[PDB]
Design a protein around this ligand. Structure first.
Ligand SMILES: [Zn+2]
Ligand SMILES: [Zn+2]
Ligand SMILES: [Zn+2]
Length: 72
């Protein structure tokens, strides 16, 4: 499944792609912890439910940092 594994001091950027029933789209950016950034994106989507209907989301990571530590 789509599991978010929280890290302390995490800072991520979320690019939300809003796709409407008629094929038109809208994009917006959100920043902060994953929890904070996604909740703002979902709150935003909820403000559009009135005129655009129910929505579903797919979370797709695009960039990562790998911290590789050598013991010596
Ligand atoms: Zn986990
Ligand atoms: Zn998190
Ligand atoms: Zn997915």
């Amino acid at each position: 499944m789509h599991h978010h594994h929280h890290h302390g001091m995490e800072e991520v950027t979320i690019k939300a792609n809003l796709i409407f029933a008629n094929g038109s789209t809208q994009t917006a950016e959100f920043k902060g912890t994953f929890e904070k950034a996604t909740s703002e994106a979902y709150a935003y989507a909820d403000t559009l439910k009135k005129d655009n209907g129910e929505w579903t989301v797919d979370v797709v990571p695009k960039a990562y940092t790998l911290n590789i530590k050598f013991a010596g």
